[PDB]
């Protein structure tokens, strides 16, 4: 919720979009076409994986029995051992739940962030030839074909080719 994109001004996500986290749905003369963006999907996935590899780490640290399940140790040292172990259980349990809540906040805002980085980029591409309607869409103010779409996608769309055209239409 940090950036306003996901669960913000985009109303929802597309259950039909199997092949990415982020993508494009366009409507022009020819038809309607959908394709998921690679560069930013990969980008997020890679940060999630980098989180995992950090926690899925194995502690190389060995501990032995100070205790005895078969013949109980003497009672005073038994009680110190148990009280310490419980105190450690407190620390680790707090650490566990904190670490996980925090990673989750960050993962969610990581996602909001990359959406709202796809957006702001396409916006920058199109310069003055289209408009923010505000549901995560650009109304294009010139007729455009499906090879014009692809050129937005793979980031080649030239603006000063369609500039004048789309400007009187505003």
């Amino acid at each position, epitope marked *: 919720g940090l950036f306003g994109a996901i669960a913000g001004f985009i109303e929802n996500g597309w259950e039909g979009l199997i*092949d990415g986290w982020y993508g494009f749905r366009h409507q022009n003369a020819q038809g309607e076409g959908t394709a998921a963006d690679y560069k930013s999907t*990969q980008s997020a*996935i890679d940060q*999630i*994986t980098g989180k*995992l*590899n950090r926690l*899925i780490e194995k502690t190389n640290q060995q501990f032995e029995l100070i205790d005895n399940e078969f013949t109980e140790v003497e009672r005073q040292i038994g009680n110190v051992i148990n009280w310490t172990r419980d105190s450690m259980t407190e620390v680790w349990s707090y650490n566990a739940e904190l670490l996980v809540a925090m990673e989750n906040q960050h993962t969610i805002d990581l996602a909001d962030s990359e959406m709202n980085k796809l957006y702001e980029r396409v916006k920058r591409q199109l310069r003055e030839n289209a408009e923010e309607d505000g549901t995560g869409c650009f109304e294009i103010f010139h007729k455009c074909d499906d090879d014009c779409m692809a050129s937005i996608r793979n980031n080649t769309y030239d603006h000063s080719k369609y500039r004048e055209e789309a400007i009187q239409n505003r």
Partner: nanobody
Amino acid sequence: QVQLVQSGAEVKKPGSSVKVSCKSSGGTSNNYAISWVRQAPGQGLDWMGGISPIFGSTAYAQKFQGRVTISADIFSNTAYMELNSLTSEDTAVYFCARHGNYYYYSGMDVWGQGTTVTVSS
């Protein structure tokens, strides 16, 4: 550089199951798709399915749907393929390979050395 090391050769009786592993060494493949592709003797390559474990995708070829289970342990950097209800039609070299990205469209540029599975009496 990463290498994908598959498990040993297998000899199986009809109706049994086989589970082959593919270990990513010299680094993790968890951020990529890994597919399983088999080659029956004298025949061409045939896709079985794949898994992209951080992404959360497991995909299966229709012709093997229901008989194969593909999985991964992100923690040991290992992918697995288990094929059930084996017959002599399944005698073939199974190959695990890594895709240049998280999904199955990109060319597979790393591969396993291959596992031979023999189904016979």
